[PDB]
Structure 1
């Protein structure tokens, strides 16, 4: 009934507050709830995903929520609903431009619990992933994508599994998948990082990157220079944070084992990130709250 479905939104929000509390973070209800209501119809085949990002000097909590393509472009929805002001910049058009040029299998919206909406995702079918050539066939894609196609191809980064768009920072992430083990070999990783002028991982980091199922750079429309790069590892293990700092080791194992999960039996699947930027490295841990059987098979495929 109607009360149930509004209670669902309230339940996602209590799970978001529960997850934030594990980091000492305070959610801003007035910034989150309107976004959840606007998309309440999807919440009651919903994928809801709480991802932590922590480094030395910063720690943040994002929430992500799937939106079927049949629902229409969800960034257009949030602009029409007045939930985010259209930056007046090509990133406004990029999610719709992608659907217009490529088979998108699903969208997702993404917020940060203190500022609200900031980010959308565009997923592609696993049996029909595009490469760098198709992705720069999209007019509102940044020039940087084509300008780095030599580099991507030289490192064997071809098939892209999804993209994401950050409207606050005006950036894009290309989530490369189907990585050859040679790309993830330590010497390959070190060359790539040093060509992009980013923080060099140590031996721990490199053993992490060897485990990656996806690699993703961040690009922008101002320059062809990749802003940062992330190596993503998928695993059931709550201990894989590529850090030797006992605080980190504790923080991430705590989140991994305590983040809310709508399921009573399953050992939840985790997605770790090692992000290298020009000035630092930091670590990400995403944890599903509600998942679909489809998304379960998706995460199964990655192992």
Structure 2
């Protein structure tokens, strides 16, 4: 019953995470997993926890584990620092999450880990606010302010989250995709063409029109948008569009969850020639998907 039988919930989670990673061929480090769980295992037990796989072109599938909770302070930061998971790099990212919590009041936060690396991101979640609130933050890439007209044009006026990616040295702004233009396939063709990204098939465009949340990624090395991502949730295994991609099919059918009937969040990422791939998270305790609809003021499907 080392990894089986009667076990604490946190041990059930660890075993499930390693099983996913093995099944999808994702790399992982036992030392990094243990280090993450020493600090964060209790959080993973009691809050909105998810396991993600994603399939970047020409590399192995990555396996991430992440959680969020409705606390106004950035609790992950202290835990990660103490855990040896978050060292300064001599870079704008070092103070950015602190600046975000100073600049805009948070109603929740979360953290994201790649089990082959350690802590990748911390998220800041405010109540929905005008995007201009972000321009207060000292260490944001200069490219963010420079995209004021782009945000306005594409109805990216309602900021619903921020993140710092310590590994990638980038930041995402997340928008509530409330505008009726965002219910049309042309919107997605247009916003993707504005950046010279890849435009997906019609079948994928017809999925995107239901997206409640759009992320846009900025970095300090370039003036342009690195990639963007459209998030769509599915309330159970069967309603994931399993036919679109083999990773979607396999993960929907086989992802572990403690709750018998989990939903999923899928991120459709696009970039220039990387940046284009799919992310899928299983709602391991069943808390994430309802919270996702609620945070976007949408009835639960």
**Fold shared per TM-score above 0.5:** yes
Unpaired segments ≥5 residues, structure 1: 1-5
**Contact 2:213 / 2:230 at 8 angstroms: preserved in 1?**
yes
Following TM superposition, by how much is the alpha carbon of 1:172 offset from its aligned partner in structure 2, in angstroms?
A: 1.0
Residue in 2 that maps onto 1:254: 250
1:278 aligned to 265, 268, 272, which one?
272
**Over aligned residues, Cα RMSD in angstroms?**
2.4
Q: What whole-Å deviation, never above 9, does each CA across 1:144-166 have from its counterpart, x for those lacking one?
A: 22111110111101112212211
Cα 1:187/1:72, change in 2 over 3 Å = closer
How far, CA to CA, are the matches of 2:96 and 2:75 in structure 1?
10
TM-score, normalising length from structure 1?
0.85
How far, CA to CA, are the matches of 2:220 and 2:78 in structure 1?
20
Tell me the secondary structure at the aligned position of residue 223 of structure 1. Answer: coil
Q: Does 1:208 align with 2:202?
A: no
Cα 1:72/1:173, change in 2 over 3 Å = closer
How far, CA to CA, are the matches of 1:202 and 1:84 in structure 2?
39
Residue in 1 that maps onto 2:4: none
Q: What whole-Å deviation, never above 9, does each CA across 1:243-291 have from its counterpart, x for those lacking one?
A: 74xxx33x31221132111123xx3221111111112521111112135
Tell me the secondary structure at the aligned position of residue 145 of structure 1. Answer: helix
Alignment of 1:51-130 (within 5 A): 51-58=52-59, 59-66=61-68, 69=71, 72-124=74-126, 128-130=127-129
Aligned pair count? 287
Following TM superposition, by how much is the alpha carbon of 1:9 offset from its aligned partner in structure 2, in angstroms?
A: 3.3
Following TM superposition, by how much is the alpha carbon of 1:21 offset from its aligned partner in structure 2, in angstroms?
A: 2.8
Cα 1:284/1:40, change in 2 over 3 Å = closer
How far, CA to CA, are the matches of 1:186 and 1:104 in structure 2?
32
**Contact 2:265 / 2:281 at 8 angstroms: preserved in 1?**
yes
How far, CA to CA, are the matches of 2:243 and 2:141 in structure 1?
33
Tell me the secondary structure at the aligned position of residue 14 of structure 1. Answer: helix
How far, CA to CA, are the matches of 1:176 and 1:234 in structure 2?
15
Cα 1:275/1:45, change in 2 over 3 Å = same
Cα 1:26/1:191, change in 2 over 3 Å = closer
Residue in 1 that maps onto 2:34: 33
**Contact 1:52 / 1:284 at 8 angstroms: preserved in 2?**
yes
**Contact 1:208 / 1:242 at 8 angstroms: preserved in 2?**
no
Q: What whole-Å deviation, never above 9, does each CA across 1:167-187 have from its counterpart, x for those lacking one?
A: 011111111114213134222
**Contact 1:235 / 1:269 at 8 angstroms: preserved in 2?**
yes
Cα 1:211/1:86, change in 2 over 3 Å = same
Residue in 2 that maps onto 1:298: 291
Following TM superposition, by how much is the alpha carbon of 1:232 offset from its aligned partner in structure 2, in angstroms?
A: 0.8
Tell me the secondary structure at the aligned position of residue 39 of structure 1. Answer: helix
Cα 1:291/1:87, change in 2 over 3 Å = farther
How far, CA to CA, are the matches of 1:134 and 1:270 in structure 2?
30
How far, CA to CA, are the matches of 1:235 and 1:169 in structure 2?
28
**Contact 1:173 / 1:218 at 8 angstroms: preserved in 2?**
yes
Residue in 2 that maps onto 1:3: none
Cα 1:33/1:70, change in 2 over 3 Å = farther
Cα 1:70/1:164, change in 2 over 3 Å = closer
Q: What whole-Å deviation, never above 9, does each CA across 1:171-212 have from its counterpart, x for those lacking one?
A: 111111142131342222222111112112221221122121
Following TM superposition, by how much is the alpha carbon of 1:84 offset from its aligned partner in structure 2, in angstroms?
A: 2.8
Cα 1:181/1:243, change in 2 over 3 Å = farther
